[PDB]
Amino acid sequence: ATGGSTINFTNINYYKDSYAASATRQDFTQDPKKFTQPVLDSIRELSAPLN
Amino acid sequence: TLWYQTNYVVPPETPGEAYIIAMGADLYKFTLKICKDTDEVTQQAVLQ
Amino acid sequence: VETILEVNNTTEATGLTRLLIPVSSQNKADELCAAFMVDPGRIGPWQSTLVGQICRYYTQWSGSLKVTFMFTGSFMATGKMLVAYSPPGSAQPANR
Amino acid sequence: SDRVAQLTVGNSSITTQEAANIVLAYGEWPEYCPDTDATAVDKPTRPDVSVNRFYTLDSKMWQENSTGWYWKFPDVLNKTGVFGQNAQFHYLYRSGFCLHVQCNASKFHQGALLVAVIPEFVIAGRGSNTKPNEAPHPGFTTTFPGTTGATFHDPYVLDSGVPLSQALIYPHQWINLRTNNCATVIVPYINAVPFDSAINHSNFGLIVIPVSPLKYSSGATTAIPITITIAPLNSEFGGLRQAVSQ
Amino acid sequence: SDRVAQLTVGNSSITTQEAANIVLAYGEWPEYCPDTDATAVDKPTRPDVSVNRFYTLDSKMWQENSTGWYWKFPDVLNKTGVFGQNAQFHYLYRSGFCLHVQCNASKFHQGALLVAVIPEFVIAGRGSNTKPNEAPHPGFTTTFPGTTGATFHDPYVLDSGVPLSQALIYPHQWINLRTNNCATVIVPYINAVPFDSAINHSNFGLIVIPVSPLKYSSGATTAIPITITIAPLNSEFGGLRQAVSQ
Amino acid sequence: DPVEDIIRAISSATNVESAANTTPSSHRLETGRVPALQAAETGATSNATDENMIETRCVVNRNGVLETTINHFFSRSGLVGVVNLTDGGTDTTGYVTWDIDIMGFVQLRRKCEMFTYMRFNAEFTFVTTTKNGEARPYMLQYMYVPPGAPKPTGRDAFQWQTATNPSVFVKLTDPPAQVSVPFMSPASAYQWFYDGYPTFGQHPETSNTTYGLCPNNMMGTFAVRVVSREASQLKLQTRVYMKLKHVRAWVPRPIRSQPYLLKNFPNYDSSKITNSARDRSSIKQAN
Amino acid sequence: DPVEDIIRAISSATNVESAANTTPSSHRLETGRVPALQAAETGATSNATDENMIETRCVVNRNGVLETTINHFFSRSGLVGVVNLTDGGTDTTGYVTWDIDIMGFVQLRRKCEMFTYMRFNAEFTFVTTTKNGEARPYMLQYMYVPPGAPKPTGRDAFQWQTATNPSVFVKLTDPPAQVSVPFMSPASAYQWFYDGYPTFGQHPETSNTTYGLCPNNMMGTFAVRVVSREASQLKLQTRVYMKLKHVRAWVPRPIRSQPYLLKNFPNYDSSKITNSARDRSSIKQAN
Amino acid sequence: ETGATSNATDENMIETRCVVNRNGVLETTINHFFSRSGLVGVVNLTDGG
């Protein structure tokens, strides 16, 4: 945290093109549930999977 | 370690042995830092 | 994602039987079966797991691992096992 | 939603896919000693997760001539883990238990096991001597078997001179190899005093007996063990001193 | 209302009629690990009164040639009491300490003792060898003396290569035989990690040194001991496993 | 705040003043509802009832349930002991002590041993007669000698001054003496079964004579004399009857089928075990 | 409810932007109030001040206190290492690795060792020259090889592909390279003193080479080469200067008076101990 | 056999404490993982004799 009044500037671009710029803007998005649990019928952690 | 709690008990006429398959993964708590280059790969000459 | 720990990684394990843990009816009760170190970025059965490859591009790791065991028997095969985890310390436990 | 159970105590946990409910002895849960019942003034110690957890003894193997086994509690645990250490440094012990017994076999096997919990379980000398001098008594290794368990000479009279058929008064369960592979009983602290010495006195014994013998047709698995896993719910210790194993 | 003190911890208590205040190292009290600083997920154990209490080592006897002694903490306590047992069955230890040193003599005696608390106290090989191969190192029995304590070969440089005169940066006190017969320091848990292994790592050493030597005119008492009594304030343990003494 | 992890019985009671009634029940033809099938592997008894097994009528049941309570079951006097006071010619002690153990006589012993823990009061009656039977007009002394108290050494010895010990003075021609006794256990209940040893130390594997002997049951000694100077020539027995009252009981246990041998020990014959039920000719003939 | 027994720092912070002022104080003639007498046996320093010892004037003190903070004290670049890259004729490796330990050079080592625990960032500058001194126009590669990463086996070996490892490409004629480095310790602070062993097991009493070596300080290796195919004939040193910034420090400890010997060990001479203060002719002559 | 990974967690397997976890997750994104320069090719220009 901290960094009071550090006036950061990075993403400013000197060219008319978008791909000339510098990464990132980051991303915090995740969706593990599509790779880890890609099943039709949802299964709870309490219940046994197969009944 | 993986120990026998009781025993692998099987009726007559059935195979006398089986196989466990083990798998591994991470939980929501898992993280990493200071990215580097792996040790598994080796190269000698430029791939043609 | 769960991928397959290669616990039988030893020699004379042929090609694909390296992934299997043999279970049969014992004689002396209270027997050991298989053992592996927990370090996912270390040489051993974790070297074949996806999580073992990605933690190997990084210098450090933190978190909880998970180890899933799937028994392929006949429907008629029954049994119980004890899957134990011992934090750092004296070497591999000698007894159950 | 019945036959599948999981029990989690401490850093240990137990799963069973084949189970018949759970018995709660005398309709009570284990609990800490209330201020009104307590007597000793000093402050008890309560380790919680380091003591309360599942310990697993060695397995007793199961034969056609087997007459059945018994253990004593806390005695089986006095040498093991942090529970065994606290009970040696303290003069005053209190707690309950959760008892779990694993025996499995295959749909071609058969038999039944009586699992009971006997408060104040007193073994008995075997002999015709009516003089308290010449009359025989059991040895310490018999009265308090330890981890290794003991065996019945006369399982019918329960070695105490009392019929097995009426053992169903105690909190019990059966392992019937066609029905369930485990028996679980949750025992409260029972005693005529709030605290006692874990070393000198065992609250209750556990009993596994073949009412109906093991049978299997040739070619099936001959080796059946009986494993025991017990956890000390709600433990307290008082009267701290040096270590005494007995 | 100053020179008379009583300290009560657990079932143990300490009285002193001659005392110079009390030192609270770095202005903090011992405390349990906050949820924000903690890392390990499992639940720690907190015995309270069974671990936290005054343990008393043997007494070091006090002579004219004595160069001074040191101990390591928790190491001195790893074999004693219920504190020694918990530290063997757990991989993760945290706590503070309360240190108390008793040396008394009579109004015709004289001397002074420097009592300090040194975080991360590293002993040092003694020799002129500049090659890390041929260079000497101290033995395990030296690095971690145990209950029996160790002694200084060079008390002036504190065996670490550092001048004794600047030891007054650490939390300290003096026993000046004309003024006070005890020195008491209350040490918080200090370390760069919240938990650690009591067996592999000692947080801090204790140091008793004769800056001014003992003198008494003939006919008075020649035998002066130095006794040490230490209590583990606010203890936690985690990572329960089998027992490891080292 | 900084560390968070730091921050009953299913069964209930009901008054029953009479035996249970019976409601009318008709037949059932349908699936899914099965009162008969039980599973005893859960240790619980079958809850199936009269009314779901057959078709029943209505029965208002005024049979009384009252006589079977532990108060009425255990409040009766029965013999806990017998004391033989010679006092006659030849070798003459002049008094007899009886340590108080009510396990010495089987008939009242088997009722108590249905239970592990008991807390009660007591009513003791002392019926004393002569050798064959009779009552002469001799004065008697029944003295209670609690643990730690001096036992009397002679007929006239000073321990009979009883400035503290309770005593009863009675003539053989008087109706039998009687007193009420409290619950004197230093624990919270009497216990007839103690699995354990009274003290620490190393226990012999060959012969353990201290196994199973609870300290909490040691109530002291009962001692008799004939109040007199010289001696009498008579010989008398005192029979001791204990009634239990205000009694509470805990943790029921099975009833003993084997013959008793010793007072303080449940020793039975490893040979010779007697079956709990008599034997018939075949399992297919009920009679 | 049923079991009841189940149911800070004195020092504070103040901003100081300048040296302390001095208030006027007159004499004192009276008993009971004694600023001079101290007792050091409590481990606390004398709190006596200018103004209670003598008579003082008033001094407004605008001397600055700022330059002595741990930020300004520790933010300077000083040499942490030297790396010798032959690359020349005869036996030629073609590269040199330097394990990163800043304890190798005494002058910056003694400043750090005033403290037990330190958490900081870093600014590394790489000044490379030739054997005597010069700069030619050769391209260089400075690569960081973190723990567990493959170390390069040759001048041209594949580990220089650096698809992941950070690397710096620079010409000897360019101004010295410079980068910022974070706090990479797997613990929460660096520690220059570790009393303890990294692993369990039985420790030799004869020679303990593992005593005092903290694992948490192992940062990997720094490796140099000359980017090229055949080889150069030059021979060059790279000097490595580390600046500390954003630094925090804990638990101050005494400053080392004895000569250092080894990087990783505080070994000193049992013979030959040098006194901390030079010796004069007599204690009675100040000069 | 459903191809889905075990959803069991720390907290239902054992008894746990409370851990506020400020470890950063950021460095492992595909942007930071793949933004580094590494050698894709080498070109040999003789031009000599």
Ligand SMILES: CCCCCCCCCCCCC/C=C/[C@H](O)[C@H](N)CO
């Ligand atoms: C005036 C004479 C009065 C006699 C009073 C005697 C009262 C003694 C208390 C009786 C309470 C029950 C006896 C104790 C139980 C069993 O005997 C124990 N097994 C003894 O070992």
Ligand SMILES: CCCCCCCCCCCCC/C=C/[C@H](O)[C@H](N)CO
């Ligand atoms: C492009 C090249 C960049 C080089 C980056 C190297 C950064 C390494 C981290 C330096 C942090 C301080 C070093 C650690 C402290 C002491 O050396 C320890 N005693 C090591 O044993």
